[PDB]
Symmetry: D3
Subunit: 270 residues, 6 copies
């Protein structure tokens, strides 16, 4: 089936008395990949659309045209995709392109038809998609995981030994506002980003080491923080006014997506 | 003489128990033009910046560079100007251009220096500015009030007899996401946008001015269609209408207002019309 | 076909956090005229009773006795009626009196039987009634629309060109507490009333079927609003302003009481 | 040295979450008698005025004229007076009448000048006044304490052995809407309105005084029968009980209180008794 | 049936805006004696367990072993019993002891099996039990009502004429932290603990019973001395009083109540007594 | 410079709408060791007293007698001490005993005088004290760090590699209701109590210190298992965990913490393990 939900924006003052269940409602997407479904969220935090498409038997396309006041999905929007699942393919205005595990794609404004397929149905592909408003059309570009540039950072003393792969980066590509990346924490480290008011971020956590892994994501004003506890393959959206960092009981990975009006804190928490 | 304040976005459920003072603070810009000053707002409703610059003696320029993460103000933004005051002038990267009353200007992305001047100091120009994030450079275009096309609408039976001027309209011009217009109500009429609407892919800012006599007040309605609130406006004040909110107002006398809109599309037939069954 | 509900009084700080649904409940009488029914409100704002009686086949009378601790309705109360519907009649302790459209009546304390009938059932009379505590008997009096003094007021620039008709006015009549009038807004005007020692407004005669009236209440610096359909009523406590604006013109009946 | 404060009416739902401090503010008059002052409350509970006048050197009169939309205080109001203090005298449009301790007076509508004096300055008179809106003039009547009819009731088992004095009673005199009485609790018993009640067409105001010893306290109960609250009282304080509320009290020792009532009917049977089933 | 509910502790500031229904839930045990049942509360106010045991046909035992992290109920706890019902008996490690009406028993730490029985089924025994954490074992002691020491106090002037019985009193017996007593009010008096107090290193639980006639009600007051609340009680109900709280009551008629106390000391001198100036 | 503050208990429902600032106030002791000072808190969770003693020039004694209703501090209480600072000494009923870093002491009920000294003033000793109510006197015992039994646990995959030292342990010594231990996390590990739990018959207090670098912070979690909150801690701060609450923490680097436990059972077996499904 197809489903897209709408979550509004808030101020720090609004959430200050939200309980645990409300925080989950306004800031957490509890399900992203369901076999045969397209699950999306529309957040008024800069009007990002994010979610997953996991085709099994029929090929799937994001069919929203009139819900956005445009003739087709990408008439005034750009799209970035990373596949965290099995062998699949996306075919763009008729031209098919095979996407391996952890391969990525950027599709620019004005692309008329984008269709997601899975090769193996019992081990389907999991396309994590992020779309943002766009005013200029830029060229489409496949980002093989082989050629994604790896940057090791962190250390063991600070429990943040990870590897950052830059996928959709302004120093390597032209896009309108959208930036995506992918961070793998090495075993024995579980800590990420440890406020920009001119942009915002959304994190999608996955690849939990063992099934009993949980992740604590922190959000809020630096001196008034809250947390949201995450299972595997869930995503949390961070407003501009909020810090964004997390801890896990073990290591994990996550895809981050960023937008705002440009493309470029301290230690006093609570 | 330069000030920019920040207002956040909200959900309908958030404002549901705001008292009057909270409502005014979160949605109303109480002062826009002060002689010699630049007064602006940053709303996280689609990151619009709006406000006024009113040059008297020295020219003024909106010098936001690093507060926005860019090298100059308009490095990733477009700009629209309407002059509601006296004879003034704008100089754009060295090129001077005279702006009489009700003249308007569109400035495209990448324009590096925009400097506002007034010709007569005792009757200064009142530049209402509206800026929105932009990704494509479109050409600058002065919108003379003479050549603004007038469309009369409304009637006396419904108290909405007015004349609409199109200033920055998608059917006349290329812009990234920004639209502006100017609506003047005739005497005896005081109702705007009355069959009311909500569009989910755009948002609007109303700036009320040209009040008839000094005791005029305007009641601006906002909120979900079945849970509406109002804010009482004096002359030269502005209201931010989030997408989930209706936007309409009535005055004790006639008035005028400039509306500025932005969002992810610019098509006008993307609205949900609100039937007259509301609250 | 008889109903009387009870609404309490509030302070300004009490209503400050009412949502619209609560504001509607506490301050708005959503239904007044239903054919064959008597619909009333009892407000503890000076203990006014207001409502409607719309007789169709059988005659109607407001038979409150022990609910007010008295032997008959008007034992300690005065009553005012305006008929906004069809040809009707009032029978007062046996004497029948014909009431045309927009005719009015004052009924004083001690009157034991007041009985409402309509001539044509298909076009029934719409009796808007208002009762207030009373201590002195004043004579009953028919108020024909012909004899009500009209005062034109307002202008077009301020959108409040109207005509005020006085029916129960202290300068023309004796009553204990009660004052009633009738205001008609001219086409093209919609603003009305643009006091601490209370008023109740009943709006009707909406020009077109999509007409609405926004009624404002609250302390002058902290105002709220209530949206009204045709033939609905709002009660204004002494501490509140009284204002309304409509998408078109309309008419409304006002009833007032207090200490002067 | 004159004061009148204004208290509004509430519903049961409104007060349900009042703390102790708000409950006192909304329902309690903490000071009533001050030498040389007139202290009043105006409650929108049937628009009753109650308070005290205690003259020492200069004689006092309640000069509310335009504050009530009338030419003089009693142009549309009734007045009931009881003196709980020293020997004094009140003069009515020129006629002087000496008022001893526990004497009472009823003054009808239209009386233009009422002046309260104290005879001994060091032991002054305490005039507790209660005024209620009035439409008919009824004759003035001195109610000497000698000639007031007493009725003893209650028993020792139920701690409510008392004696009731009727002062302004519909069965002994005509008044517009006002009724007053006076209850003295016997030693060893302290409980008033013991199976309590709610009349929806009348409201009552109780003023407690004559505490046995200086540390006596009275706990006055008010509220809906299933949601009750209480207010802790010192000597010579007053509490206002809405129509929707029960009204009863118990004290640590004996005391006395005068009660004043009004509404739309002067009938004593209209009340709803409450079986002892109440949270 | 066996039933034990758990109530947490609160601060003064927490209850300040409780409505009536909440106050009942957090502080009142509405049912204690039901034939054939064991009804208990565990309050995080010093971890007191109190309730009733009412055997009718089969004998009853409080078999909390692993629910408390111990091998048997009294492994780290002491127990106090007063019988307010018919002739019964309790069996202690096989040893039976007859308990008449109003007899009391103390059972010390380490006692492994305590079994409650009733002689007459149609008139069953009502064992009010209070168990408290204990670290030192003291000998078990039957406290007969005949041999209970009586102390009359109070008078009729203050409506508190009563007689106090000592049951578990640190001056006649050794216990770990538990003290129980029994107070009966005379006819014509209905006030207990009236010059009231707050001891900060101890807390009390009051259980009201023996109401005079079936329409008796008792108003128990609790809270910070300046922010007082009340709870209306029926017969055979109990209230839990936190350390920060005053505790007292008034009844429409006379009554009786058992009080149980624990804390970190057993000195009756440690109390911050409360003068009548402060609610 | 003696200071003891008093904190009350709360129910899970009470804290649910606390902001961060209330949570810090209700649950966190932000300063414990100040040179020359005794800083303690009194919590109504089982009436634990904990805090710090840091003598510089003068020896220090906890001089609480009438504040607790007893003749000397430990008249009805036991005491646990761990030294986290420089070389010091404590003298117990006259007998002096030198206490080096990480040494510990148990002082039982009835000990009359306990006097703290530090040897080097510029590097004073840090006596972290925890006191608990007691009913039986047990012998005093020095718990040297040399003879403290070390138990290594955890792994690197789960980031909880630590060493648990048992100081006051039911399997090595008799105490009334009190356990203290010590946990040192190795470099690269930060999670403590990650197989998490709640015990309903006792409660724990965590005091975190020895942060690796000055920018270390520890996030301590508390609340019902499905409704968790967190508190951010600096070095040498303490958090109080009610029985209904989970207690576990994670840091940006490694650290150490002392835990103290008390309740009605000393048994480790009695915990409800909370699985990894929690919010
Ligand atoms: Zn960031
Ligand atoms: Zn619009
Ligand atoms: Zn008015
Ligand atoms: Zn009464
Ligand atoms: Zn006590
Ligand atoms: Zn634990």
């Amino acid at each position: 089936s197809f489903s897209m939900v709408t979550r509004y924006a808030h101020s720090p003052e609004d959430i200050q008395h939200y309980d645990t269940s409300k925080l989950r409602h306004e800031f957490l997407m509890e399900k992203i990949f369901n076999p045969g479904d397209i699950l999306l969220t529309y957040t008024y935090n800069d009007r990002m659309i994010f979610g997953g498409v996991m085709p099994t038997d029929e090929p799937l396309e994001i069919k929203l045209s009139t819900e956005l006041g445009v003739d087709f999905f990408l008439q005034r929007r750009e799209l970035g995709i990373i596949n965290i699942g099995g062998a699949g393919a996306i075919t763009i205005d008729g031209r098919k392109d095979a996407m391996s595990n952890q391969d990525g794609y950027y599709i620019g404004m004005g692309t008329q038809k984008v269709v997601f397929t899975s090769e193996d149905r019992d081990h389907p592909a999991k396309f994590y998609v992020v779309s943002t408003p766009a005013h200029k059309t830029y060229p489409n570009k496949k980002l093989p995981f082989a050629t994604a540039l790896a940057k090791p950072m962190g250390d063991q003393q600070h429990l943040n030994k990870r590897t950052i792969y830059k996928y959709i980066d302004a120093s390597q590509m032209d896009t309108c506002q959208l930036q995506m990346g992918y961070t793998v924490l090495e075993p024995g480290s579980s800590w990420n980003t440890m406020t920009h008011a001119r942009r915002m971020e959304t994190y999608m956590y996955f690849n939990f080491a063992d099934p009993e892994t949980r992740v604590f994501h922190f959000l809020g004003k630096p001196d008034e923080t809250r947390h949201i506890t995450l299972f595997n393959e869930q995503a949390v959206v961070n407003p501009s006014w909020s810090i964004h960092c997390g801890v896990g009981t073990t290591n994990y990975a996550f895809i981050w997506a960023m937008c705002g009006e440009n493309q470029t804190v301290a230690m006093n928490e609570l």
